[PDB]
Design an enzyme around this catalytic site. Structure first.
Site, PDB file in Angstrom:
ATOM      1  N   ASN A 162      -9.309   4.998   2.867  1.00  0.00           N
ATOM      2  CA  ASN A 162     -10.137   6.432   2.218  1.00  0.00           C
ATOM      3  C   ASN A 162     -10.354   6.930   2.986  1.00  0.00           C
ATOM      4  OD1 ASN A 162     -12.221   6.363   0.237  1.00  0.00           O
ATOM      5  ND2 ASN A 162      -9.980   6.618  -1.361  1.00  0.00           N
ATOM      6  N   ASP A 183     -11.934  11.350  -8.081  1.00  0.00           N
ATOM      7  CA  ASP A 183     -13.092  11.112  -7.312  1.00  0.00           C
ATOM      8  C   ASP A 183     -13.292  12.016  -6.162  1.00  0.00           C
ATOM      9  OD1 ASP A 183     -12.027   9.401  -4.948  1.00  0.00           O
ATOM     10  OD2 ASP A 183     -13.520   7.675  -5.174  1.00  0.00           O
ATOM     11  N   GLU A 209       0.605  -0.793   0.066  1.00  0.00           N
ATOM     12  CA  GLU A 209      -0.437  -0.260   0.414  1.00  0.00           C
ATOM     13  C   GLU A 209       0.976   1.133   0.167  1.00  0.00           C
ATOM     14  OE1 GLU A 209      -3.080   0.761  -0.307  1.00  0.00           O
ATOM     15  OE2 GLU A 209      -4.030  -1.279  -0.159  1.00  0.00           O
ATOM     16  N   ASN A 216      -6.911  10.870  -4.986  1.00  0.00           N
ATOM     17  CA  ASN A 216      -8.105  10.080  -6.199  1.00  0.00           C
ATOM     18  C   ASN A 216      -8.596  11.599  -6.815  1.00  0.00           C
ATOM     19  OD1 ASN A 216      -7.561   7.537  -5.569  1.00  0.00           O
ATOM     20  ND2 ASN A 216      -8.193   7.997  -3.453  1.00  0.00           N
ATOM     21  N   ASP A 247      -6.232   8.886  -0.339  1.00  0.00           N
ATOM     22  CA  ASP A 247      -6.000   7.477   1.020  1.00  0.00           C
ATOM     23  C   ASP A 247      -4.604   7.917   1.532  1.00  0.00           C
ATOM     24  OD1 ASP A 247      -7.772   5.864  -0.664  1.00  0.00           O
ATOM     25  OD2 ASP A 247      -6.567   5.984  -2.216  1.00  0.00           O
ATOM     26  N   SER A 258     -11.622  11.456  -3.309  1.00  0.00           N
ATOM     27  CA  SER A 258     -11.435  11.057  -2.131  1.00  0.00           C
ATOM     28  C   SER A 258      -9.651  11.118  -2.029  1.00  0.00           C
ATOM     29  CB  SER A 258     -11.932  10.460  -1.972  1.00  0.00           C
ATOM     30  OG  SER A 258     -10.429   8.775  -2.664  1.00  0.00           O
TER      31      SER A 258
END
Length: 129
Positions: A59, A48, A35, A46, A52, A50
């Site tokens: 997220n 969208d 990760e 991201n 992480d 969001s």
């Protein structure tokens, strides 16, 4: 901070992850490796809306609040910035919550893609625990 493999394993063990909901310690170390490369500061922004956050790339739509993400649920009840600390406790507490909220480790794409079905014990082999 960028953890070492064995150092992270020991910290995760101290925080109760070995065999948490039936997932051995090596699963958790493997997930962190793929990760974040063991980097507590890792972020991935991201398209969208969001982001992480941290060593386990948690997220911001479901799990932590960053104030900027549509549809926020904040199910870990924490600011996302807490997930960017050198101390792993907030990340571990939220990771436990993710599994408790009826997810397996399939919640982590890197686990599913790069750890599932592999010899995950390799990730703790040789370490003092």
């Amino acid at each position: 901070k960028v953890f070492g493999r064995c150092e992270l394993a020991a910290a995760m063990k101290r925080h109760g992850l070995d065999n948490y909901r039936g997932y051995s310690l090596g699963n958790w170390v493997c997930a962190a490796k793929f990760e974040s490369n063991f980097n507590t500061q890792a972020t991935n922004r991201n398209t969208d809306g969001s982001t992480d956050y941290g060593i386990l790339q948690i997220n911001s739509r479901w799990w932590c609040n960053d104030g900027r993400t549509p549809g926020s649920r904040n199910l870990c009840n924490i600011p996302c910035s807490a997930l960017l600390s050198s101390d792993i406790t907030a990340s571990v507490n939220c990771a436990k919550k993710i599994v408790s909220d009826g997810n397996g480790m399939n919640a982590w794409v890197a686990w599913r893609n790069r750890c599932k079905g592999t010899d995950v014990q390799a990730w703790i082999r040789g370490c003092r625990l």
